């Protein structure tokens, strides 16, 4: 086993894992659609109820047993060993669209290396059609079919989505995005080449630039005409909509996929920690840091929105209707092209996006690699770099389908379905296992003998009452509500829902298959097999 080394390494790695690309455009948007200033209370409630205890439990499991995601079950619950393969499949499905969004951001950064930004005027080969929507104009030329040159640069030059008719017509592959994905994957391979020490060394700088970048973005957007409108519209308490459950479900899913428990990353990260560490303080600090980073990201996004609304003389909640990764590459691109320092600020913002994506990518890939290597110790002598290269090649082959012209449809499909009930039921199975199958008393005794004190009664009752019920509530809310996805001028067909359900079930289906395999492979009667499937084996 290898040691993290310095204390800052593990903290920076967990911070870069928690602070992802999702919390910069999705969190402020769903906070706007859900109350606004009144969205903070349910956010922190759902956090302290089901994201902080899960984070603490996962960190304690990773630090105590010192294993990945396939060998911990060998020590707590052998019947739930398929969670490792489920985590691998989920992480591959996530890494596909994550790396393709990283490639989009890298291509934007490369195209933002000129004096004049290419998404500024409507004189290019990609800015072809409707271009009445502009900035710094007294004439009000409003059209129901109009658009902006930035959306044309995004959808016709970067994505080239006009060369496809939807999910049913996927043809051609953009070579520029392919080269961007290749360069990004080489960077990833060189970042987790040797092991966790080089990963921490790259995170030391990759997880630090976004913070000063957000500081610069805040001090720029604060000194903009009309940002106060966006500020007061983001911090507008609307308790009338808080009566429904949709705001609660959105806040719960947001804090879950932001903190990221049950993804198989915290276990491997804490596997290298020392036995005399303090995982509670680390978990609390990283959770508060991720929450504050989400807050500042929403703040700068809404200041940009308010400045653009003031300079456009248009009400809020209409300039950024479309969600997804396009929100940034359209709205923030227009705002930067409107700013005097366009090239520098665009380069800075795209470097921030690249670093935020790379942090989570490194975290997930290292977690998967550690989970696989902890299960098969015989492939750790002279197969580490080979397995890392194989994982990178598999991720590249999985993202190749999203790197097409109409690939953005598959990207949204993966971002909306892979981040669905699969991770939720994985975390639920883990929680109920540690609670009943492994025993909450034994877990508390392990936490006491590891740190030096047992956790308070709050976490003890929470892990057994709230977090499993909270995850089950999210599951039953996501199951009976099929998402109605819609990209730019395209409604998803009915078979898209079936494909999303299939790709979300194929990752979860590993657990019951492994349960059946374990129940058949061991001799004895039924109850004897059940008993043998819960009690851990001898070391």
């Amino acid at each position: 086993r290898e040691t993290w080394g310095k204390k800052v390494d593990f903290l920076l790695s967990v911070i870069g894992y928690a602070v992802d690309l999702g919390n910069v455009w999705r969190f402020p948007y769903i906070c706007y659609q859900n109350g606004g200033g009144a969205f903070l209370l349910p956010y922190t409630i759902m956090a302290i109820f089901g994201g902080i205890p899960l984070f603490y439990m996962e960190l304690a499991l990773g630090q105590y047993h010192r294993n990945g995601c396939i060998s911990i079950w060998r020590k707590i619950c052998p019947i739930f060993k398929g969670i490792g393969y489920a985590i691998c499949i989920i992480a591959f499905y996530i890494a596909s669209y994550y790396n393709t969004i990283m490639a989009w951001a890298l291509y934007y950064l490369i195209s933002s290396f000129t004096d004049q930004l290419p998404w500024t005027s409507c004189k290019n080969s990609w800015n072809t059609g409707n271009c009445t929507n502009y900035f710094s104009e007294d004439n009000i030329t409003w059209t129901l079919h109009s658009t902006s040159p930035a959306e044309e640069f995004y959808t016709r030059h970067v994505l080239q989505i006009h060369r496809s008719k939807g999910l049913q017509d996927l043809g051609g592959i953009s070579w520029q995005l392919a080269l961007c994905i290749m360069l990004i994957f080489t960077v990833i391979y060189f970042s987790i080449w040797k092991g966790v020490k080089t990963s921490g060394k790259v995170v030391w700088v990759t997880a630090t630039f976004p913070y000063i970048i957000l500081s610069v973005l805040l001090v720029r957007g604060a000194t903009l005409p009309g940002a106060w409108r966006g500020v007061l519209f983001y911090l507008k308490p609307n308790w009338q909509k808080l009566l429904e459950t949709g705001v609660w479900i959105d806040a719960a899913a947001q804090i879950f996929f932001s903190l990221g428990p049950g993804f198989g990353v915290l276990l491997a990260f804490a596997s290298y920690n020392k036995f005399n560490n303090n995982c509670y303080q680390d978990a609390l600090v990283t959770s508060v840091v991720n929450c504050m980073t989400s807050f500042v990201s929403g703040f700068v996004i809404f200041t940009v929105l308010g400045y653009m609304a003031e300079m456009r003389n248009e009400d809020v909640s209409e300039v950024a209707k479309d969600a997804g990764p396009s929100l940034l590459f359209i709205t923030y691109a227009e705002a930067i092209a409107n700013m005097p320092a366009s090239t520098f600020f665009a380069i800075i913002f795209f470097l921030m996006l690249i670093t935020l994506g790379l942090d989570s990518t490194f975290a997930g890939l290292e977690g998967v690699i550690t989970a696989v290597l902890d299960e098969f110790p015989h492939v750790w002598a002279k197969r580490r770099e080979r397995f890392v290269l194989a994982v990178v090649i598999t991720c590249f082959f999985g993202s190749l389908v999203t790197l097409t012209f109409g690939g953005a449809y598959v990207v949204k499909l993966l971002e909306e379905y892979a981040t669905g009930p699969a991770v939720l039921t994985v975390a639920l199975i883990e929680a109920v296992a540690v609670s009943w199958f492994y025993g909450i008393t034994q877990f508390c005794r392990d936490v006491k003998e590891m740190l030096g004190f047992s956790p308070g009664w709050f976490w003890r009752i929470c892990w057994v009452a709230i977090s499993p019920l909270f995850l089950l509530f999210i599951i039953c809310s996501f199951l009976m509500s099929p998402p109605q996805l819609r990209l730019f001028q395209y409604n998803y067909p009915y078979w898209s829902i079936i494909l999303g359900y299939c790709i979300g079930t194929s990752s979860f289906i590993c657990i019951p298959t492994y349960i059946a395999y374990r129940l058949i492979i061991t001799p004895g009667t039924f109850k004897e097999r059940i008993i043998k499937s819960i009690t851990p084996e001898t070391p």
Partner: antibody, heavy 118, light 110 residues
Framework: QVQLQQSGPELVKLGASVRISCKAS????????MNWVKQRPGKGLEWIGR????????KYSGKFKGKATLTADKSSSTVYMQLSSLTSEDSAVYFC??????????????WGQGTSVT | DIVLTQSPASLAVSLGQRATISCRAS??????????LNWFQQKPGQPPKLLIY???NQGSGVPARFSGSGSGTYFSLNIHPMEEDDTAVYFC?????????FGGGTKVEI
């Protein structure tokens, strides 16, 4: 409806300078390129250069890089062309073709009557 | 700078037949799915008139007899059936983002 009204013809002089205008009307003047071509008597067309009145970006292909000056005027929707070092080779008919959008491949569909510089 | 070589230099076919005008570009003019190559037509004493844009779609007031096709670095202009009103000079201009240059021009007679 799009109509590009061009000026009348002028007289070429050795070492002088001529300014040919093109009064475009009927479309978004600041959202479409305004190209210029050269048709010598008895020979084919010769592209001069384009100018985008939205921001004033001008392009040139060949020899007309340092002798042709394209200026835009959004107030009156008129594009000018300042020719310099007028020789016997510049005695041709300079048209004013409005390029289409990108989906149409920048099609120069609407042209002018041409000013025969004799 | 992308040069264009039109073939042949002169064309002379009877009425009612099919006239084929080729235009081989030096480089590729397709980058965003659409072709950046147009076809024009001019008569003695008349400014040029656009016939087909993007080498696939026809103009506004152009008859259906001017059918265009081709992609990549080879394009064709089909005029069938042609009459005594289609005897003019047909050019081939590309609109690539590096330079917009014209072709050679084919004087179709008869």
């Amino acid at each position: 409806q799009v109509q590009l009204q061009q000026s009348g013809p002028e007289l070429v002089k050795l070492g002088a300078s001529v300014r040919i205008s093109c009064k475009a009307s009927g479309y978004r003047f600041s959202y479409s390129w305004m190209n210029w071509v050269k048709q010598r008597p008895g020979k084919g067309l010769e592209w001069i250069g384009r100018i985008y009145p939205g921001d004033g970006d001008t392009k040139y292909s060949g020899k007309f890089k340092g002798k042709a000056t394209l200026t835009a005027d959004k107030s009156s929707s008129t594009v000018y062309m300042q020719l310099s070092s007028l020789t016997s080779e510049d005695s041709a008919v300079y048209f004013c073709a409005r390029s289409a959008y990108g989906s149409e491949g920048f099609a120069m569909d609407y042209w002018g009557q041409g000013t025969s510089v004799t | 700078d992308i040069v264009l070589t039109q073939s042949p230099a002169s064309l002379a076919v009877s009425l009612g037949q099919r006239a084929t005008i080729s235009c081989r570009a030096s480089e590729s003019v397709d980058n965003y799915g659409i072709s950046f190559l147009n076809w024009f037509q001019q008569k003695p004493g008349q400014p040029p008139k656009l016939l087909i844009y993007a080498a696939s779609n026809q103009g506004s007031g152009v008859p259906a007899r001017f059918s265009g096709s081709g992609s990549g670095t080879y394009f064709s202009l089909n005029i069938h059936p042609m009459e005594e009103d289609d005897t003019a000079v047909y050019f081939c201009q590309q609109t690539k983002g590096v330079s917009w240059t014209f072709g050679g021009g084919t004087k179709v007679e008869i």
